[PDB]
Amino acid sequence: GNLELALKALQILVNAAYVLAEIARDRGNEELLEKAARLAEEAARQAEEIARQARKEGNLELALKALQILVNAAYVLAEIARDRGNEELLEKAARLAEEAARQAEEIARQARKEGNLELALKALQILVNAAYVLAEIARDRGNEELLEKAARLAEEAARQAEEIARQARKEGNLELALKALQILVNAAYVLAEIARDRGNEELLEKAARLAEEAARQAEEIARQARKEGNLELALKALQILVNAAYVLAEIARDRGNEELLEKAARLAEEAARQAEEIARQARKEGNLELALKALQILVNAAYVLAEIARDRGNEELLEKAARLAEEAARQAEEIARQARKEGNLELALKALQILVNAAYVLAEIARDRGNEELLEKAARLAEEAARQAEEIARQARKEGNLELALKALQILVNAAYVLAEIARDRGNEELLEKAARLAEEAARQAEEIARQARKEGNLELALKALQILVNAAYVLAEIARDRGNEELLEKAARLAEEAARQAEEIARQARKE
């Protein structure tokens, strides 16, 4: 009776259904769409059963993980339904999302009574996630009543998160305060998305106040944590500053406010400058994991700046974003190299992941600029990561370290995704086919590892392998997308149905246990 392991399997089931739904749409295959809906519905049916058992036993953490699957299932059912006019599916999706929101609010109440503020914020994140799914459904159906309910759910989450941040400060617990600020940012993003259903100016202004409230406090918390020498805390705060700036840019973009656009960009640049200084300090002290966390903020800040620059081809911001991403790529390469010399292969893989993420941001900038050399530089970064990933995977499997191997295969899938996107940017069939083969190799090794894991009875390991299958199948679907590649869509559908079927078997065994 391993409920945590069963839920992990069901999340894989939802993720596979989501991928099959995307493949079914690209190919107009109504039968495949029906199959994806049943998988998503079956995942939600079992998750809702597990939610009930978890709460009966008082395991609120497990119950929240079950509610998240309800929400993800609802999202998948709404994505399937909106193309056609499938009101019966949208109603099921709304029912699931509303049930998740209700239970989330009940658990937030109970968590706060018992003084468990971290649990309460996890309940509020589910509340925000359910509000997001409801907002999409309500926008599809032109149901203003339900849009109003989604907005009220997001606002309730932000209101409670504001209260918990104040309690957290009073207990000196700034880490917890930051988790509350992240709820504010996520709630603000949902409200702005709801307000973008034509001129709800009062909702947009509410969303902007929330995001600005989080930015202001994240910036001050980062400054103080850094002055007190608490670098790990400062970076968490800088991530929230970047996330707040992203939402402010979306609000600014929508409301045509060039002033707010510029403010959002300054916040993102300030976060990147602080992260750059923290990375240099962390490497001076020899703290490579810290340093890599700083570099990912550089990439995230650069991604925000490039998005801000999108519409109007802003020359300063695009070149600023380019230098930030290249800075992170170079330092990640250096750290990967040192980590591999010191035999620290997990650290090396984290560095390659930052390299892939930097390369993705550079490819976006190169694309918008028609910059051939930067596109080529981005592809070389992605190809460097993929090559090092398969070397680490090969050695990991040789020594029987399957978890390490799977982490390396995930890097390979991510690098293939970046290379696929560059291949789109050049209209190059050859590069596109090379990216697909990188993804196919990763999927092939992941299937064999899943088989070896299950033969040994290691179901936790096998589920991690199945997730790579899902992610690989998603990359293959993105490559065949808008190209009419029937051969590739079939390989993608095959991988996602493989993961789905094995996830179902593992869920069943975990529930017996």
Residue numbers in the entry: 1 to 513
Publication excerpt:
Circular tandem repeat proteins (‘cTRPs’) are de novo designed protein scaffolds (in this and prior studies, based on antiparallel two-helix bundles) that contain repeated protein sequences and structural motifs and form closed circular structures. While these cTRP constructs have many favorable properties, we have previously noted that their ability to self-assemble from smaller subunits is compromised by relatively limited contacts and small surface areas that are involved in packing between repeats and subunits. Based on those results, we hypothesized that a new generation of computationally designed cTRP proteins with increased repeat size (corresponding to longer secondary structural elements that increase both particle thickness and the number of buried contacts between repeats and protein subunits) would improve both the energetics and the stoichiometric control of self-association. In this study, we describe the de novo design of thick cTRPs (‘tcTRPs’) with repeats composed of longer helical bundles that form a new underlying repeat topology and demonstrate their solution and assembly behaviors, their structural features via X-ray crystallography and CryoEM, and their ability to be functionalized with additional folded protein domains.
To validate the accuracy of the tcTRP9 particle (harboring nine repeats), the recombinant protein was overexpressed and purified, its apparent molecular mass analyzed by size exclusion chromatography, its thermal stability verified by circular dichroism (CD) spectroscopy and its crystal structure determined. The protein eluted from an SEC column in a single relatively uniform peak at a retention volume corresponding to the mass of the protein (56 kDa) (left). CD spectra collected at 22° and 95° were nearly superimposable and indicated the presence and retention of the helical secondary structure after heating (right). The crystal structure of the tcTRP9 particle, determined to 2.1 Å resolution, validated the accuracy of the design. Superposition of the design model and the experimental crystal structure produced an rmsd value for all alpha-carbons of ~0.5 Å, and close agreement between side-chain rotamers within the inter- and intrahelical repeats and interaction surfaces. The only positions where the side-chain rotameric conformation significantly differs between the design and the structure is for a pair of leucine residues (L11 and L37), which interact with one another through van der Waals interactions between their side chains in both models. Repeats from tcTRP9 and tcTRP24 are shown with darker shades and lighter shades, respectively. a Alignment of the sequences of an individual repeats from each of the two designs. Both designs are based on a 57-residue sequence that forms an anti-parallel two-helix bundle.
